[PDB]
Design a binder for this molecule. Structure first.
Ligand SMILES: Nc1ncnc2c1ncn2[C@@H]1O[C@H](COP(=O)(O)OP(=O)(O)O)[C@@H](O)[C@H]1O
Ligand SMILES: Nc1ncnc2c1ncn2[C@@H]1O[C@H](COP(=O)(O)OP(=O)(O)O)[C@@H](O)[C@H]1O
Ligand SMILES: [Mg+2]
Ligand SMILES: [Mg+2]
Lengths: 283, 372, 7, 188, 372, 7
């Protein structure tokens, strides 16, 4: 994997295993499993009651309150139709599949359910882009800090949109490696034509975040991506959303991959060192 | 003096015909073969030298040699013999009656041009002639004034950016890769399969095989994977002796050499990269027009799907904010000849010719200054 | 370069 | 100067075609700054000022401080190396050289025209600078008609339409008899 | 901490040495080559990457690529590799022991400077460093305070008028034309003669040929006419394979591209015209001093007769009432390095350096305000 | 060719 995927393959696999035997009579196959994914959010699949004819999926979003305050009426009918019901687990969006009714599609529904986290996350970014597109008075900027102690802020003014990232590294070992990783992020531009500007700042927080109570400290960097309609229209919106949401885990995974790469290089060099040493043993 | 003859010395198949006709009247490959055995029978003292379709028919006892190699002539005797054959046996028109038009690839040595002009003016004493470029004639045939030419012939592949009423001589790139290298690579791979071909007769056989059962692949890795499941791609060809040869991955492997010259070991770039570099070297404003118009011609660009692959590669390399269009006329094989005929038919060109009087008084160097 | 000329 | 600074950013333009391109860019994405230092500081926090332009080839160029840097050359000719003064200083000197009584009228009326004075905020900056330089006891007003580009042509047409001007023209007979020097004495 | 190291990242060559020495201790071209073939033998796992004279020696199986193009870096990995090689393998001096001096062409992007400073301060943790201009170091080497610099390097040609104790940043002109374009044009013309050269190894061969058998012509038309009588100008060169190449008009044709950029298709002016424009843009009084002193430096200005041609052209353009003098020191190749060494040796410059503490507290933007 | 490549 290079671009971290957005479709959790666990739900895809379990739903495929369930549906491939769906047309086999009165087959309940009681299921009750708990999962976890990036952003420190817990999933849960479990039948509502003894009736096993219905399967339910739920989320435990950390910043759920902001989503509820904003209102996601768009998400209740566009991607998810009539198979969405009020929250049960922890006041967080939960859906269920009605097996008694014939499920016509097999892959489309599974794919739609696979991107649940990003599907709910987009409710704010797409709405801000709509606000700036529609000509409505620039909606008040918002700050969305997810499970990680870091913070996310967005400003949606006329003629452009903005987004800023706050980064926090826990272990002392990876702090410097991540700093080096993000140092060259703001400059690599020789292979991109229609791409947004990128900048890095750690000592001086941007003037936008002074009033906002976002991630403020000392060992915290900042990354901002300037947005323009040429790469934020109705066509190139999903790709940008996927890239930004999968930014954090992308950085993490590629840091670990670099660690493995350097491990391999040093392991290779050990052989040369041993070859040099072997000059001491006799013929 | 009513019309003129246009001859295209392809380093492969030569094309000739009258000025005005929409199709050539003579299409034969450039082969000058000589007997390789001793000869015993007495009732034959026949034609120590062979040329044309005759050479193709009896290629089994002859050492076929191509007079032209990668756009540059190597043996002048063979070229003069083929010229004489085409003029007399096929066309049956005396050189004095009508003038002759000649075409050559760009960035060719001046020695070849001077020698060709001298031979044409001295041996056949043609009343007049001219030297042109295949790409400009391709533009004339296509009825357009702006675009980029992909003249991938049998011996040379080259591009020449053009704009309304003017050209850009400083952005011309010529690549030696052409059909002959593809045929050699095809022979090499056919060896890896289990079929061996060395002599020139089997060279012609493999050339026909490639002409009939080769195509380009949109994705190389996907095609290789589908070849791993080799149950729907293999095809069979019937050899003259009756033997049947099964060809699989080789169908879409050899054409990929054009986009991946590293297969043959050449430290260069593919046609897409060269065209991108040529267009980038041009001025910014004309880049849009060049992208909007991309004319291609030659016998090496008839592989199905080549246009789609080129479009995909160019769009991937170029910024994804405009539209790139590929134009693939179904008669690109004779586009150069059609353009030459149209240019000759032009009234204004009746005075641009080079006559014997001015050539003799000035010298062979005149052609150098005649439209570069 | 980024715009104009290559480098 | 805009070409020179665009070079410092990383974008190169030399020939005349790119000269026209940069001229269009300036015509479309340039403005004046009320305060130079404050604008520079806000540029240090470059997250709301940068703008993108689409080149004919499709390349995108991001312009930041250059938007409000080149126009400041008018008020700071030292940037190009010219040992002169800005438009505000020259206008102040010209008005001061006039008689005292007409200074009030000149201050009360300040007409501007030309294609180089369409930058938004130029009028406000000029007003602020003149009021700062001039005594702070009267009122200074700047008039910025939205059709100053063709003001000269409109004035010429109106002058030609004037009945009294139908006789001030210079005809071939008088020009030939007198000579080319006549135009010199014709209204200086 | 007794001396400092001066490194000149020339567009085509790298010069390095200790501060105080009159000659560089390391002169190798900027080449970062990688293998192009597969590799079969088992007794060698050698150096996937190659740099320096090693790359030049075994250039026949490598894809040589210049890390720096026309004064601006394109690949940072290659530049870091060459820096590491020069610091360790050749100089064998740790970065911490002594500081480093860097030079770059004028009117370069600030991104390159910031990235170079950040890499130098972070990777090698040099105690201190500085960034300067090649032309000012040329003045220091020449022991003069007033004049005009003609820094025609391998990648960039630029001029910077100067006066006693001050410079004129508003009269700086930078031309992309340099040795690489001359080599490309030389290859193109060598093709017209009959000799073909495409890959990078033949690029180096043609570079050597130009370095050895090229000169400027006082009069272009007279030289062309004398070439028409080609019996005393042609010269022969011995290729590595033993083939002999005869070069005639090409000797004095490629250098003329400097005075006639229209040959390559660039809509610009020659070095003489650019220098005249730069001097005219200066104040009237300093024009006399600038005319009286004209320093030139770089590897592209060693062609014999260049100084005479420049003098003649400037005198023809300039009014014929004063005296114009051209100064052509015979060691202009390393003038920049000598100037850098002298500047480093200056006592007053021991405090102008940039140290790690101030850089870390302030940031990379400090170098921008450090002497522009 | 004469130098480089055959032709
Ligand atoms: N029907 C065909 N399909 C694919 N390639 C062909 C076909 N006919 C010819 N070719 C290829 O094009 C070459 C000849 O085309 P041609 O244009 O006459 O070469 P040239 O440019 O010297 O005139 C042949 O070498 C052959 O490889
Ligand atoms: N003896 C020479 N005569 C003419 N040109 C030379 C000679 N030696 C080198 N050159 C040219 O000068 C260039 C290298 O000189 P150099 O000054 O080191 O370039 P740079 O400006 O990057 O330092 C080469 O590209 C070469 O073309
Ligand atoms: Mg041909
Ligand atoms: Mg240099």
């Amino acid at each position: 994997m290079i671009l971290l995927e957005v479709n959790n393959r666990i739900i895809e696999e379990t739903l495929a295993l369930k549906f491939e035997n769906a047309a086999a009579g009165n087959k309940p196959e009681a299921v009750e499993v708990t999962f976890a994914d990036f952003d420190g959010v817990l999933y849960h699949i479990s039948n509502p009651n003894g009736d096993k004819t219905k399967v339910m999926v739920s989320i435990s979003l950390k910043f759920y309150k902001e989503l509820q305050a904003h209102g996601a009426d768009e998400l209740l009918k566009r991607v998810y139709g009539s198979y969405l019901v009020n929250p049960e687990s922890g006041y967080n969006v939960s859906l269920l599949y009605d097996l008694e009714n014939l499920p016509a599609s097999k892959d489309s529904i599974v794919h739609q359910a696979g991107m649940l986290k990003r599907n709910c996350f987009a409710s704010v970014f797409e709405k801000y882009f709509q606000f700036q597109e529609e000509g409505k008075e620039g909606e008040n900027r918002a700050v969305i800090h997810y499970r990680d102690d870091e913070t996310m802020y967005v400003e949606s003014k006329k003629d452009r949109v903005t987004v800023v990232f706050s980064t926090v590294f826990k272990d002392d070992d990876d702090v410097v490696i991540g700093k080096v990783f993000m140092q060259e992020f703001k400059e690599g531009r020789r292979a991109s034509h229609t791409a947004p500007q990128v900048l890095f700042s750690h000592r001086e927080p941007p003037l936008e975040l002074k009033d906002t109570d976002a991630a403020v400290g000392d060992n915290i960097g900042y990354i901002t991506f300037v947005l323009f309609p040429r790469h934020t229209n109705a066509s190139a919106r999903d790709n940008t959303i996927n890239l930004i949401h999968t930014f954090r885990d992308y950085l993490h995974y590629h840091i670990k991959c670099s660690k493995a790469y350097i491990h391999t290089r040093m392991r290779a060099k050990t052989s040369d060192f041993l070859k040099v040493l072997n000059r001491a043993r006799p013929d | 003096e009513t019309t003129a003859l246009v001859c295209d010395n392809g380093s492969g198949l030569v094309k000739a015909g009258f000025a005005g006709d929409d199709a050539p009247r003579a299409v034969f490959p450039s082969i000058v073969g000589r007997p390789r055995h001793q000869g015993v029978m007495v009732g034959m003292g026949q034609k120590d030298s062979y040329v044309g379709d005759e050479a193709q028919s009896k290629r089994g006892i002859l050492t076929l040699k191509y007079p032209i190699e990668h756009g540059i002539i190597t043996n002048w005797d063979d070229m003069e013999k083929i010229w004489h054959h085409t003029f007399y046996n096929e066309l049956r028109v005396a050189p004095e009656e009508h003038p002759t038009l000649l075409t050559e690839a760009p960035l060719n040595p001046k020695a070849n041009r001077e020698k060709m002009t001298q031979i044409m003016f001295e041996t056949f004493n043609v009343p007049a002639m001219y030297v042109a470029i295949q790409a400009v004639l391709s533009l004339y045939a296509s009825g357009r004034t702006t675009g980029i030419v992909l003249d991938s012939g049998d011996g040379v592949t080259h591009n020449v950016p053009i704009y309304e009423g003017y050209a850009l001589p400083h952005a011309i790139m010529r690549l030696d890769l052409a059909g002959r290298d593809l045929t050699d690579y095809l022979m090499k791979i056919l060896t890896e399969r289990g079929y061996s071909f060395v002599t020139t007769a089997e060279r012609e056989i493999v050339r026909d095989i490639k002409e009939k059962l080769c195509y380009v692949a949109l994705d190389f890795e996907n095609e290789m994977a589908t070849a791993a499941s080799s149950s729907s791609l293999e095809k069979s060809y019937e050899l003259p002796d009756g033997q049947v040869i099964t060809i699989g991955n080789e169908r879409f492997r050899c054409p990929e050499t054009l986009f991946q010259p590293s297969f043959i070991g050449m430290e260069s770039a593919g046609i897409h990269e060269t065209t991108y570099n040529s267009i980038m070297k041009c001025d910014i404003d004309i880049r849009k027009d060049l992208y909007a118009n991309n004319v291609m011609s030659g016998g090496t660009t008839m592989y199905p799907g080549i246009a789609d692959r080129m479009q995909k590669e160019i769009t991937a390399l170029a910024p994804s904010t405009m539209k790139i269009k590929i134009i693939a006329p179904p008669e690109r094989k004779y586009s150069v000849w059609i353009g030459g005929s149209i240019l000759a038919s032009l009234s204004t060109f009746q005075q641009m010719w080079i006559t014997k009087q001015e050539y003799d008084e000035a010298g062979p160097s005149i052609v150098h200054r005649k439209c570069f | 370069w980024x715009a104009x000329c290559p480098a």
